[PDB]
């Protein structure tokens, strides 16, 4: 139980007008776990993450990091407490004047770290992220990932307990978003680092984090494991940003072959939405041989989170009508949403 938030409420007032960014929000984070917080564009996710590091001072609330109250620290004591919280941002936010060595070494120089203690720590922290070689290269000629790697190396210059990623994947290309997220995870497994996230994209939530929260209109709507969130959508909001955000292709070459009602010597087209079944459940396999039906996968997308299958599939199903009916029903009874989208 590392970082914890209790009834966080914050409002900024400009031009004799007050606005609620956060309204009574509590977030419990376990020690050494990755934690996502998704939300609507500027729904308070932007502000919420930085309440932990006290970049934004809370109007009402209590922030407990490593079992310590942050609001009571005032000025002098917070400087020491922020050593244990590293942070990296959407845009990579680093000094272009200093090289990667110096950029990672900067937070250590605030502690008056002597001589080569910084050389020992920087070189190895740079080796961790993947930047050896380029110790003397300036940020000017670094790529998005390369910059972000310096940023990760920089935030870990204090060997902190908690880490804060503000949309780190955002500016990175689909190829390099892989690497950086995997690097964060590799650290999570090695150092046992606690991590808080806020991401505008869903694919980030699937791959790394354990528990994901949904925050919209300045209040925490859902809090559960990723497994439970994508399986059972709970709120109508989360269901919108989860179900409507995944596929349903329905190719055109089949579209024109499609019918409304039955057809002489035909087969039903249907799609299977997986509601979070289980990986040990051999549904498509058992259904195929017990009922004697050919489930031909025309199109499919399904992802893994927390030991459960979920996604969508477009499939052709042949076999006897006596069988086909029962076949669909067996899956249905095992929690598989099945729509009949015409016949072929």
């Amino acid at each position: 139980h590392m970082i914890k938030l209790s009834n966080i409420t914050k409002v900024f007032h400009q031009g004799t007008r007050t606005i609620q960014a956060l309204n009574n929000v509590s977030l419990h984070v376990p020690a050494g776990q990755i934690y996502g917080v998704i939300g609507a564009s500027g729904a308070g996710k932007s502000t919420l993450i930085r309440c932990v590091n006290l970049l934004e001072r809370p109007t009402e609330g209590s922030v407990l990091v490593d079992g310590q109250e942050l609001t009571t620290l005032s000025e002098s004591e917070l400087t020491k407490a922020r050593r244990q919280i590293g942070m990296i941002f959407q845009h990579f936010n680093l000094l272009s004047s200093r090289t990667v060595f110096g950029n990672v070494a900067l937070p250590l120089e605030l502690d008056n770290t002597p001589k080569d203690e910084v050389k020992r720590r920087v070189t190895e922290l740079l080796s961790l992220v993947g930047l050896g070689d380029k110790h003397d290269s300036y940020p000017s000629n670094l790529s998005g990932g390369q910059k972000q790697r310096v940023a990760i190396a920089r935030a870990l210059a204090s060997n902190p307990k908690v880490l804060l990623c503000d949309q780190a994947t955002s500016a990175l290309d689909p190829a390099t978003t892989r690497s950086i997220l995997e690097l964060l995870k590799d650290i999570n497994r090695r150092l046992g680092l606690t991590i808080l996230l806020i991401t505008h994209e869903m694919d980030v939530v699937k791959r790394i984090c354990d528990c994901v929260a949904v925050i919209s209109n300045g209040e925490l709507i859902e809090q559960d494991t990723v497994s439970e969130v994508f399986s059972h959508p709970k709120t109508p909001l989360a269901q919108k940003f989860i179900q409507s955000t995944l596929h349903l292709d329905i190719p055109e070459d089949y579209q024109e072959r499609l019918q409304a009602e039955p057809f002489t010597d035909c087969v039903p087209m249907l799609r299977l939405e997986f509601t979070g079944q289980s990986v040990d459940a051999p549904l498509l396999s058992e259904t195929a041989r017990r009922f004697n039906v050919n489930n031909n996968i025309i199109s499919a997308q399904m992802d893994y989170a927390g030991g459960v299958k979920f996604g969508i599939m477009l499939t052709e199903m042949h076999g006897t009508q006596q069988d086909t009916q029962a076949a669909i029903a067996w899956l249905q009874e095992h929690h598989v949403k099945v729509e009949v989208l015409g016949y072929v």
């Binding site: 590091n53 970049l55 917070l78 400087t79 020491k80 407490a81 922020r82 050593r83 919280i85 590293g86 942070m87 941002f89 845009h91 990579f92 936010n93 680093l94 000094l95 272009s96 004047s97 200093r98 900067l106 937070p107 120089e109 605030l110 300036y138 000017s140 920089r154 935030a155």
Partner: protein, 216 residues
């Protein structure tokens, strides 16, 4: 031209440089702090304090709004009490500064604004004190701009020295004023005109190559 009168142009180039580079120094001495004060006091920044920025901004606006020779002439009595003469090289720099400070104070604010906001959050995230931010984050990032701000303000001061030469505080300014305004002299007016132009190109070029040394 005559040999001893050629040596008078040399007496002036000494002074004209002497004014700008000294007055420029005292400019940044007073101005760079007021510039950083302006950048920090912007609402939504490290120590916001919006009422202070309303005061300090209006101060440097009114001073910068005053045209130079109206300032210099208006400052004469203060220039006298502060220096004691009101005439000559020493008295010259005080009206050049104070006309120079608000000039660069505004450039220092703008040049410092070229820095992305993200660095200041990262600075605070790492846990640095506002002085540590200004010392080793803001300044060095703004440096390439601040060096240009030097180049810009230094050449304008050369121009001010010229106007300042009319009231008798300066070298190439006075030699240009005396021999061209009353009793024009084709030679030496062309020399002082070109000798100032080549002096600007020298400080322009020196400003470019010094920015290249500290560039991205």
């Amino acid at each position: 031209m005559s040999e001893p009168m050629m040596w008078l142009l040399v007496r002036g180039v000494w002074e004209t440089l002497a004014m700008t580079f000294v007055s420029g120094f005292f400019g940044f001495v007073i101005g760079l702090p007021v510039g950083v004060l302006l950048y920090v006091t912007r609402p939504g920044q490290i120590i916001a304090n919006a009422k202070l920025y309303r005061t300090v901004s209006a101060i440097v606006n009114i001073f910068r709004s005053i045209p130079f020779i109206i300032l210099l002439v208006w400052m004469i009595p203060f220039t006298r009490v502060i220096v004691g003469t009101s005439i000559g090289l020493q008295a010259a720099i005080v009206p050049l500064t104070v006309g120079a400070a608000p000039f660069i104070a505004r450039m220092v604010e703008n040049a410092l604004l070229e820095i992305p906001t993200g660095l200041i959050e990262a600075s605070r995230a790492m846990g640095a004190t506002p002085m540590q931010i200004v010392r080793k984050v803001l300044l060095p990032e703004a440096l390439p701009g601040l060096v240009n701000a030097a180049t810009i303000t230094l050449i304008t001061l050369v121009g001010y020295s010229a106007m300042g030469g009319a009231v008798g505080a300066g070298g190439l300014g006075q030699i240009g004023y005396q021999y061209g305004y009353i009793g024009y002299n084709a030679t030496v007016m062309n020399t002082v005109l070109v000798l100032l132009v080549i002096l600007v190109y020298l400080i322009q070029f020196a400003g470019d190559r010094i920015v290249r040394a500290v560039t991205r």
